[PDB]
Amino acid sequence: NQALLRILKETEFKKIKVLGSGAFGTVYKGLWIPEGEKVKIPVAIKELRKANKEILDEAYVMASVDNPHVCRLLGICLTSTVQLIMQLMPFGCLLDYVREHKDNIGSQYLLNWCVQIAKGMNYLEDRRLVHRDLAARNVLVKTPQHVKITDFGRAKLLVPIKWMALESILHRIYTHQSDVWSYGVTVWELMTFGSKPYDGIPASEISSILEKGERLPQPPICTIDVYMIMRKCWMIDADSRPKFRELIIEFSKMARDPQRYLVIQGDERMHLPSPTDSNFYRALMDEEDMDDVVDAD
Numbered sequence: 006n007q008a009l010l011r012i013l014k015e016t017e018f019k020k021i022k023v024l025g026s027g028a029f030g031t032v033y034k035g036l037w038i039p040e041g042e043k044v045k046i047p048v049a050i051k052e053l054r055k056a057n058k059e060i061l062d063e064a065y066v067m068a069s070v071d072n073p074h075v076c077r078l079l080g081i082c083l084t085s086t087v088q089l090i091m092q093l094m095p096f097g098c099l100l101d102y103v104r105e106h107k108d109n110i111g112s113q114y115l116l117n118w119c120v121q122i123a124k125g126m127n128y129l130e131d132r133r134l135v136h137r138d139l140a141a142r143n144v145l146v147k148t149p150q151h152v153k154i155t156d157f158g159r160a161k162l163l164v165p166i167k168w169m170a171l172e173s174i175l176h177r178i179y180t181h182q183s184d185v186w187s188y189g190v191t192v193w194e195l196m197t198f199g200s201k202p203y204d205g206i207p208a209s210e211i212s213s214i215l216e217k218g219e220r221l222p223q224p225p226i227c228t229i230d231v232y233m234i235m236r237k238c239w240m241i242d243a244d245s246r247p248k249f250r251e252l253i254i255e256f257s258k259m260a261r262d263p264q265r266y267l268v269i270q271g272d273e274r275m276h277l278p279s280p281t282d283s284n285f286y287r288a289l290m291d292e293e294d295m296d297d298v299v300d301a302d
């Protein structure tokens with residue numbers, strides 16, 4: 006559906022601040038100024054470092070993604086560079102969030118984020134789409150109770166060895182089941198409050214380490230059931246890994262008894278927001294439809 010992707014002229018938006026960069030592109034806070042208007046509307050803009058016809062084809066796919074837990078591509082500007090326009094998420098990315106709130110995040114939040122990320126990935130799988138680059142740095146925070154996967158389509162439009170399934174490292178094979186491996190690493194990032202996976206180990210050594218049977222270590226707050234889920238995501242046989250629909254169920258179950266599955270100091274005073282505070286967040290900055298968060302029994 007072409008109506009889902011707005012083609013913008015470079016003249017109707019401006020980049021005002023660098024937010025971050027990767028090997029692939031640079032993300033800016035930008036301002037959209039509608040033609041004829043004086044209002045300046047904040048947006049996110051990513052500029053990547055015949056081809057346009059292939060780019061637009063993928064952009065239409067990225068603009069078709071409609072789910073509470075995956076960010077949708079809203080617009081594109083094709084000049085000498087490709088620029089992607091998306092909704093700005095003022096809370097930023099989840100990796101930064103867990104780092105900046107280290108040991109000050111309740112179990113109910115951590116487990117619900119795991120659910121939401123699995124729901125987003127399950128939606129992509131239902132659409133027959135593979136993400137290929139799931140990582141905490143590519144999950145954004147809409148509100149503390151609402152996270153969303155971003156950077157979908159990046160690979161197909163344009164290498165993170167330490168997030169990749171072994172078969173992806175060795176054979177650059179990407180499937181829903183290799184997405185599950187990366188989901189496992191992403192969960193590990195959350196549960197360690199943003200530790201770097203395989204810290205101090207060169208990327209060139211990762212395949213041999215995995216082949217030896219070594220994996221990321223159990224995070225201190227994780228009980229055995231949570232760690233076993235992670236380990237299952239990192240099995241060599243792709244078909245032996247959990248499915249996203251299974252992950253949704255498991256983390257949803259744990260979210261109903263959060264203190265049973267994660268051990269966090271001071272957890273009893275870090276509950277989900279009250280209905281009052283939840284309604285306030287939604288009214289201000291989250292008016293979109295979404296499944297209710299899983300509360301504790």
Ligand SMILES: COc1cc2ncnc(Nc3ccc(F)c(Cl)c3)c2cc1OCCCN1CCOCC1
Pocket residue numbers: 024025026032049050051089090091092093094095096097098101145155156
């Ligand atoms: C408030 O911060 C962000 C909001 C965002 N809102 C929406 N989208 C973002 N990323 C993004 C990702 C892919 C895209 F195609 C586009 Cl257009 C945008 C965003 C990235 C954002 O920050 C990215 C950089 C985070 N760095 C990580 C390193 O330490 C400094 C902070």
